[PDB]
Amino acid sequence: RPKLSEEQQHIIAILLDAHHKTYDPTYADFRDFRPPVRMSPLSMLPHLADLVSYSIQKVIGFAKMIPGFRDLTSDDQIVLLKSSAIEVIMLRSNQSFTMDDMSWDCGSQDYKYDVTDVSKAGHTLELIEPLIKFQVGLKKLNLHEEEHVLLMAICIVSPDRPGVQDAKLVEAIQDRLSNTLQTYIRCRHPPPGSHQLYAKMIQKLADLRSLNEEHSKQYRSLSFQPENSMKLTPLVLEVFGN
Amino acid sequence: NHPMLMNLLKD
Numbered sequence: 067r068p069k070l071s072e073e074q075q076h077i078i079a080i081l082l083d084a085h086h087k088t089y090d091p092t093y094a095d096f097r098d099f100r101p102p103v104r105m106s107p108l109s110m111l112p113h114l115a116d117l118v119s120y121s122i123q124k125v126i127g128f129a130k131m132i133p134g135f136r137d138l139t140s141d142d143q144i145v146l147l148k149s150s151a152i153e154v155i156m157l158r159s160n161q162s163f164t165m166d167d168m169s170w171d172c173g174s175q176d177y178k179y180d181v182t183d184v185s186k187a188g189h190t191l192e193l194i195e196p197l198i199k200f201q202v203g204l205k206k207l208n209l210h211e212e213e214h215v216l217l218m219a220i221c222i223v224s225p226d227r228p229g230v231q232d233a234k235l236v237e238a239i240q241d242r243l244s245n246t247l248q249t250y251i252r253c254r255h256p257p258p259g260s261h262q263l264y265a266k267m268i269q270k271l272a273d274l275r276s277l278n279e280e281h282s283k284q285y286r287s288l289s290f291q292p293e294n295s296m297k298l299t300p301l302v303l304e305v306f307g308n
Numbered sequence: 309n310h311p312m313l314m315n316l317l318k319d
């Protein structure tokens with residue numbers, strides 16, 4: 067019988083609040099980034115580097131609040147964040163993504179991003195096409211905020227990331243979150259929306275591994291010309307590579 | 309060698 071324990075409602079309450087403390091749906095800090103230019107070879111690189119850098123900071127803030135994450139070694143915390151960052155950024159961006167025009171709508175036209183914006187940061191359709199496909203299939207799940215925050219947390223605490231030490235520890239933390247998610251859908255997600263919802267959510271994590279790979283490829287090519295590398299941030303260089 | 313990520317992670 068599907069029962070959401072005390073522990074499980076606690077986990078969801080913590081992850082919701084963690085998300086609330088690290089995602090500002092008013093997008094007010096965007097005015098601090100180097101300004102967007104849509105005139106234009108890699109004209110969007112400065113602005114989008116800043117947006118991603120900022121996003122990395124919020125992801126790290128969210129990760130620290132994941133129940134059990136604290137119990138990991140600093141080294142494993144680091145490995146989980148470096149490998150998952152771009153994935154959790156893609157996940158968290160779903161909240162501003164819109165199927166009307168397939169863009170990310172962050173409050174205003176200046177901060178409304180589409181495929182050509184992402185191109186003008188130095189990316190090709192090899193990445194962007196499967197990116198848009200992902201966003202669409204994710205948006206169509208119409209996840210409860212509860213499922214969304216659990217999905218981000220499950221993504222971060224992944225035992226198979228290359229470089230993990232205490233995989234067994236990472237696996238047990240993630241299981242506690244998996245089980246909370248499975249149980250949540252059962253108890254609080256009505257059919258038909260609930261049908262295979264967990265398997266479809268995990269499929270989105272598989273999709274993200276592939277997006278992560280392609281992003282890495284194009285980032286290594288982007289960041290090889292030191293003139294592009296110059297336009298990035300110190301946090302982006304540290305987290306994505308140098 | 310991750311001073312900034314380390315710093316943002318600290319208690």
Ligand SMILES: Cc1cc(C(C)(C)c2ccc(OC[C@H](O)C(C)(C)C)c(C)c2)ccc1OC[C@@H](O)CO
Nearest residue numbers: 111114115118121155156158159162170172179187
């Ligand atoms: C709204 C938003 C969109 C994006 C997208 C459009 C997915 C994005 C933005 C930039 C991207 O490329 C970055 C590029 O690889 C560098 C070199 C600049 C790091 C990629 C691959 C995706 C990323 C982050 C975003 O912010 C979401 C939250 O973190 C803040 O609301």
